From a paper:
The X-ray crystal structure of norovirus native-size VLPs showed that the VP1 can be divided into shell (S) and protruding (P) domains that are connected via a flexible hinge. The S domain forms the scaffold of the capsid, while the surface exposed P domains contain the main determinants of antigenicity and host binding epitopes. We determined the binding sites of six novel human norovirus specific Nanobodies (Nano-4, Nano-14, Nano-26, Nano-27, Nano-32, and Nano-42) using X-ray crystallography.
The Nano-32 binding site was located on the side of the GII. Several residues within this loop were also disordered, suggesting a certain degree of P domain flexibility. These conformational rearrangements likely correlated with the major entropy change observed in ITC measurements. Four P domain residues from chain A (Arg287, Asn344, Trp343, and Asp316) and two residues from chain B (Arg492 and Thr519) formed seven direct hydrogen bounds with Nano-32. VLPs to HBGAs, none of the residues were shared between the HBGA pockets and the Nano-32 binding site. Nano-32 induced conformational rearrangement of several P domain loops, which in turn altered the hydrophobic landscape of the P domain surface.
Numbering used by the authors:
A (entry chain C): 1 to 103, 107 to 135
B (entry chain B): 224 to 346, 350 to 538
C (entry chain A): 224 to 346, 352 to 538
D (entry chain D): 1 to 103, 106 to 135
């Protein structure tokens, strides 16, 4: 299956920082929004951040606004999630997926309970653990 | 009101909805003491999928996901833990109102198949591959698909990669001896030990006296040992698929269907097709049903709870 | 006249008709030099199955029959000859107007799977299963003559004269020696005998059009590679067209790939009478489209209808 | 997986004799006609002989009438085909199957060539009969 590959997850102390990579596996990243999602233990899939096809427009969940920075490097076929000032609530499996719905300018962060199959190229995820 | 219909498929043109097998025979067992509550092959007559039922024949008893690590062995062989994703690649979500990820096996046993992996490659740009025979014991406390991970064992001792796309293709059962705990009517504990299953498709039973459940039976392959194990499903996968497409409203709690010769149109026997998606017949005898495979069920009419079936 | 329809199934609810796999992506390859003439997943729009196409998803690239004996072979492994029956248990009949028994693989390669046996008992049967490889390019691959050859890593534990089943899983290899070519048909009757009763080749007649495929990625036993199998129509379409038997009112049906909820058209395609799709696309590779979408029949059109580029 | 089993096939000289057995594998013969069929090299499946559920009525293809004898032993769950005065044209794979169409009839029916095999049930893997020198 063609899917994104997310990596760069590891163990960190609170206030620490991490850079996640959302990379295209085999194929080439095209012109569409790329989103970061996370699934904390026992909780549903939730939207974290997205970046437009242009890479110039981004959106963030209120939970991470101001602490997280998403960026696009199409040259390396990779979307980055720069996570700063990590909190223990940020501990989850992080996923990335593409929005192929309207091949708009500004990202949309899906509300909780959203349908995951509306997005494509879901990766196997990367684990982010922020200790106490 | 959209007329209820069944597909025109003879017995040899049907597949089992609980394991990727052709239907071999129709079957009854009036004296079954177990509660019949399978979770695959569950669909109401008006097209509502239930339990762990999904549409893909390749999804039945299949798993998709990622191996995390090799794990110490509870039984003989080499053991591996894998997280499971949904079959369509979407992340595992525990909050989903389902017993387990769709396609998850709905019976106790040692399911034999092949684990295959294709590595990811983030840019000669061709991924490495491996495949090995594997067994998944669904009765094991390590079988926790509703928690997002299961365990499989291999004969191969080393050649399984962690962190790579992993697929389980089911083939049959590893064994049916006493240690293997094969019981087609015993549900796995989807969330593991000391936690109850939820969002189950309901149990099925003939309400009418002198009626018994009619099953679509498939004989399931064995890796080794003695036995002729079988898997009985309430409806073939093609019916599940057909009912889902049509979504015809149920005009009664019971549909009268006749098993018919495809060319003459002559009735061989009749059956009740109930709202929750299962068949009953008036039969005192148990075992395989003696009937031509060249026949199919044809919808006749909606009837009430009192309609009496002709004995078969 | 019974109206033509397609089933309402998104891409993730579809199955490959040439190998037991879910559909992964839509795919085009305009510069393909090979002739496309696959024999599984072949069905006219009015419901006529062709080639080796049958209805069961479990029947695709499956074999049923009996091992006759162990045989000698120059390649690696232990080798076995098995007679093949029809998948529904009826006897092999050479006079049936088909290329080979229905479900027979329609491509060159080393097909990897499991051979399993349950003994007959004319009186609890003994059982065995082993990994096996069937090389469809081999001169010993003669299903239209009623027998094939498979190889095992296992050296002894295969019984002669017992019911034998092949469950396909994937490919053994895709290196040069493995001869994997999804568009090269096997010689169903072996060397020095030509294939017969084939489903016809398919090609875009219109300029600026290319074949649109339903692509599945196929597992590999070992080695490097990302092999894929492309089918003209998913098995569910084959099954649906067979059930409906709707008369074809022209040579081409206009279909739109649509978002399931809004109903908005994402792109359009031509669905041809013989059961295949074309699109106006210059590009090769996977089609960038949401898996959450499906083809919806719009109308019958003539030979001169022009598709919107995609 | 439930099927009849054929055995007793071998090589024989012309004018020789052979007896084939059609036995039930995993079940008990019930009340229905049992037929013997054959598929000669490069030729279609053809009916050879049948015997009724009672075991009292039999029918034969004109080509084997007088040379072949079919019999039923329900106790041993076996239908027998006694083949006498064998000819090289008798060389084939021999199969047996059950007719489940009308569980009542009296006289067997031998299907004409080109018949649909799936109209019959419990087909076995067959036994090989070779009449050679």
């Amino acid at each position: 299956q063609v899917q994104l590959q997310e990596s760069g997850g590891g163990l960190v102390q609170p206030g620490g920082s991490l850079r996640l990579s959302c990379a295209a596996s085999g194929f080439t990243l095209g012109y569409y929004p790329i989103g970061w999602f996370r699934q904390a233990p026992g909780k549903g899939l939730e939207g974290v951040s997205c970046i437009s096809g242009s890479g110039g427009s981004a959106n963030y969940a209120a939970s991470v606004k101001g602490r997280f920075t998403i960026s696009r490097d199409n040259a390396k076929n990779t979307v980055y999630l720069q996570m700063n000032s990590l909190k223990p609530e940020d501990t989850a499996i992080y996923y990335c997926a593409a929005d192929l719905s309207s091949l708009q300018a500004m990202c949309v962060i899906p509300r909780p309970g959203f349908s995951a199959k509306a997005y494509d190229y879901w990766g196997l995820g990367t684990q982010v653990t922020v200790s106490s | 009101s959209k007329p209820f219909t069944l597909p025109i498929l003879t017995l040899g043109e049907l597949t089992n909805s609980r394991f990727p097998l052709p239907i071999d025979v129709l079957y009854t067992n009036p004296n079954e003491s177990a509660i019949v509550q399978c979770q695959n092959g569950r669909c109401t007559l008006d097209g509502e999928l239930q339990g762990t039922t999904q549409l893909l024949p390749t999804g039945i008893c299949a798993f998709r996901g990622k191996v995390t690590q090799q794990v110490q062995d509870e039984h003989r062989g080499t053991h591996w833990n894998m997280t499971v994703t949904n079959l369509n690649g979407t992340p595992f979500d525990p909050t989903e109102d389902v017993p387990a990820p769709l396609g998850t096996p709905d019976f106790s046993g040692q399911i034999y198949g092949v684990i295959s992996q294709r590595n990811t490659n983030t840019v000669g740009n061709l991924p490495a591959n491996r495949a090995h025979e594997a067994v998944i014991a669904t009765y094991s406390p390590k079988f926790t698909p509703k928690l997002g991970n299961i365990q499989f064992s291999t004969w191969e001792t080393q050649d399984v990669s962690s962190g790579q796309p992993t697929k389980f293709t089911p083939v049959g059962l590893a064994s049916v001896d006493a240690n293997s705990h094969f019981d087609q009517w015993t549900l796995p504990s989807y969330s593991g030990a000391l936690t109850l299953n939820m969002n189950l498709a309901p149990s099925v039973a003939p309400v009418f006296p002198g009626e018994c459940l009619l099953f679509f039976r498939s004989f399931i392959p064995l890796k080794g040992g003695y036995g002729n194990p079988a898997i009985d499903c309430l409806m073939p996968q093609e019916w599940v698929q057909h009912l889902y497409q049509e979504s015809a409203p149920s005009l009664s709690d019971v549909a009268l269907v006749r098993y018919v010769n495809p060319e003459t149109g002559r009735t061989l026997f009749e059956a009740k097709l109930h709202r929750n998606g299962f068949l009953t017949v008036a039969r005192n005898s148990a075992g395989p049903v003696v009937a031509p495979t060249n026949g199919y069920f044809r919808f006749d009419s909606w009837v009430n709870q009192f309609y009496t079936l002709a004995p078969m």
